[model samples]
Target: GVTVQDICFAFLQNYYERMRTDPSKLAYFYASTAELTHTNYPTVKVTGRENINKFFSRNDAKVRSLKLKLDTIDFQYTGHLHKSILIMATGEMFWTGTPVYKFCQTFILLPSSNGSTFDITNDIIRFISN
Candidate 1:
């Protein structure tokens, strides 16, 4: 039995594993309708699945090594329309170059056409100053 909270927890851990260990598999989390909004600080956005995957891959490529720990990951279900999960996460990300930085990432997960499989429709990543 999978409830909204259960799915959100599982998804976040799986996503973190793939994101840090095997970025090549990162695209698996993004749905075809995904729009990657990276550096929400600078307002950079990538449209479509392929481009979104490409964008993340390139950024991950630049990081030689990384270790991340989430301070919090919270989500709420969208009441209207198609039931999407809006997750907000704040974490500490350590990259080989910068060493460490506080980071904020948000994800909007929606059911794919299958209605059972959930994938990321919207993503935002930004590093904090402190």
Candidate 2:
């Protein structure tokens, strides 16, 4: 038996994993009404699909070659909204010249038309210092 919550969770979890492995599949994971945001210094701008292509891209090969771990914190859901912070652990750099950096990303999720297809509309990333 598949519950809506279970279905949605699996949908989102799979989307997250594939986003790191297949950048081309990103479009399916996001809604057309969706928006992306990026921060630089003192300014924050909302980006559309085109901008997503420009500023954000995944090096699937690099990601796949390395060891990665993701841990979520404060996962709570109320109504149709979900919020959580995912901390990424870098196991090993598959390529040289890449310095190890620690960071956590905050995700804001909303219910979609079908199941729990939550889109990642905003991300607040914080870098950790050792």
Candidate 3:
């Protein structure tokens, strides 16, 4: 049986792998009302999977390649929501021709009714340093 921790790791692994190769597959990880926010970029806020897909499709076009390394991943149950998991990850993102930068991303994840995968309800990413 896979624990929540195992699922978390699997989700991130598949996510980053697809992010570097097939960006369109990334949309399947988010909920219908998912909200994504990028730090230092107010215009980057996007709601809904459709908008998220459009936002990333545009940004991914400018990037030749992207790689993410996870330094830490922690999760906790948020009592304010229904079976919500508050997940935080600290990592470094390396982009083509750009210096590797440290970033912290927080996600609110909810288990799907299918019980096989989770959906991201909210996600916020902040670049800490270059």
Using all chains and alpha carbons, the TM-scores for the candidates as numbered come to 0.84, 0.54, 0.84
TM-score, prediction 1: 0.84
Per-residue C-alpha lDDT of model 1 across residues 8-125, encoded as one tens digit per residue: 9989988887777767668888887688877632657888888877766777754326666789888888834848889999988776545467888889998777667788988888
Candidate 3: which stretches are off by over 4 Å?
40-43, 79-82, 96-98
TM-score of candidate 2 on Cα atoms, chains taken together: 0.54
Q: Which ranges of candidate 2 are over 4 A from the true structure?
A: 1-12, 37-46, 58-68, 78-99, 114-116
Quality of model 3 by C-alpha lDDT = 0.78
* TM-score-better candidate, 2 vs 3: 3
Worst 10 residues of 2 by lDDT: 85-94
Error of 2 at 66 (Å): 6.9
Clashing pairs in 2: none
Model 2, CA-based lDDT: 0.47
Ranking by TM-score: 1, 3, 2
